[PDB]
Amino acid sequence: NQYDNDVTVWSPQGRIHQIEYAMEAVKQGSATVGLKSKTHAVLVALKRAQSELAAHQKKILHVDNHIGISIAGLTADARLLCNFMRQECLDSRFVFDRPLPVSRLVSLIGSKTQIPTQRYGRRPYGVGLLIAGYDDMGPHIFQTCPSANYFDCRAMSIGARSQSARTYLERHMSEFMECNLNELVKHGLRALRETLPAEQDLTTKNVSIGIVGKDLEFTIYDDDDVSPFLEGLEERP
Amino acid sequence: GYSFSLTTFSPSGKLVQIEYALAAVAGGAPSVGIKAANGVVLATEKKQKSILYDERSVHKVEPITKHIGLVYSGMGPDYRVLVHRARKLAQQYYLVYQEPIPTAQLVQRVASVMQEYTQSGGVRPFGVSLLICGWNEGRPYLFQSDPSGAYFAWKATAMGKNYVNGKTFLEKRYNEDLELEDAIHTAILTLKESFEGQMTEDNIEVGICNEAGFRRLTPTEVKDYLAAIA
């Protein structure tokens, strides 16, 4: 095919095949869920690595006291974007002495990601992002796609077999707004459990949690810290 | 821009883009140049397609300096580019050495410019060949510069359509003791050898170099010469 090797080539159908191929990278990756109540925002990540000796790869990253991100796809691209976001927040604090609003950060990310899709010899960013944040307008969950399109979500799952998680979330989304923190985290954990093959279960090893809220800096609960949340979770159907 | 050459070597050792540029030159309007004892004559055919064309607008015979003149065969826009380059080069030489530039020096500099386009990135050669006339040190000079960047010194030569027949005609009719008027007659005869229709003062263009300098003949003078020829 002569239309599928460059990002500057339109197909006769009106598509760019390189961007779709880059979205495939996000579809292959491990699954993550994000949800928000009226006060908090939660990111639940399914950590995994190649072998048991190999510690589960890091999926939830700290960007700022009010912003954290979850990753799906190419990890080096994710670190590039993470460094860009950290620098933007730092510049906002240096110049205006205030935190950067989350929506403006997602706008800056979208601007950064669109440029490579229009120039010869460049490639998209093969990374899908889930952003959890808190600012003056409340808690926010944002989704970022390799096509440079971004979405403001009530809840969202990305990764492999994440359609089942999205189905679960759609069924239960009316409850989330009125939940407390443990209930919200348990909802996210149930959605994430929906992606595992029927034999696998949720352990303290393969689960990472990230929480932000009105009076809590972004916290990453991994290992023993997640045992309080995994407690009281009924078995799968 | 493109950083790579579009002219490369073929297995037989040829630079085929230069040969295709020469093919473009061989399809152009005929040009003739003759070196007399007291001057040089450059003559070309400008046969417009319609009466709607205003003949005083564009000229194929151009002055470069007071004593240097140019004519071409091939593609006109490229000719304009080369004319601008040549005029700038002559002005730079005058600014440095306070002397009008010798014809050979101008030919060498312009040929360097033409060579650059056979090796630079992202460009094609010039599809034009040039005849250059000058008067230096009480002596007339006539030169030819081709798309490759090579220059030759001629007593008489022809370019463009039917240039081989013009060359044979000039071989049979050229003489060392020619004076400029005889040379002008001979050049018009060479152009007549390959002309379709009636030659008038508006479908040919003549220029001459002598001790006074280079000048383009007015249509009246060409009509006088054409009446003499006929």
């Binding site: - | 002055p63 470069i64 601008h84 005029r87 700038k88 002005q91 005058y94 600014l95």
Partner: protein
Amino acid sequence: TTIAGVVYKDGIVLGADTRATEGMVVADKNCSKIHFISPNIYCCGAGTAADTDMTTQLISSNLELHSLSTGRLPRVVTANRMLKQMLFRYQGYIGAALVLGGVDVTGPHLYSIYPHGSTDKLPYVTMGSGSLAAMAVFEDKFRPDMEEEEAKNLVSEAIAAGIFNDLGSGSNIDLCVISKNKLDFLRPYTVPNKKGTRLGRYRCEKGTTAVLTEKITPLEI
């Protein structure tokens, strides 16, 4: 230096002196301060000699390029624009003071151009160290629409006033008459000063100078 210019009924008269000094010593006695720009435009230069020379040569080359491109006779306003933009670019570090005179399709034009890029379009102008002495003659005797001989006499008188009253001006008087039909470049036009005759012969005879070494090299013809 004394340079001057007037407009008369049919054109332009420019005038200059021929002395060049290095400090308070006379270096050249036959300098030409009237420079060629185009067959219809000429310039008189004052200030730093090298700056004047190079600036006028550069603008003349640029105008020849322009005239070859357009096929038309150059215009004095084009020279004016080129010169003043170039001089403004250098913030007065090119020390050229110029009198620019030409005749084009719009008529006779005369300009005064200052080293910082300031231009004045006037019917008579003077520049140099002897400018005020020439301007006195102009302000006393100038009339609009003079004949060629009256204008020549007036410019000659102004240059002579600069010569005899300024220490930086002297020697001969050079003139340039520009009309639409002709150009007259008159070097020299008048000679007001000559060198007195010598009264002694300073014994010039062979063998007066003592030599230590000598080498003769033959050259081939």
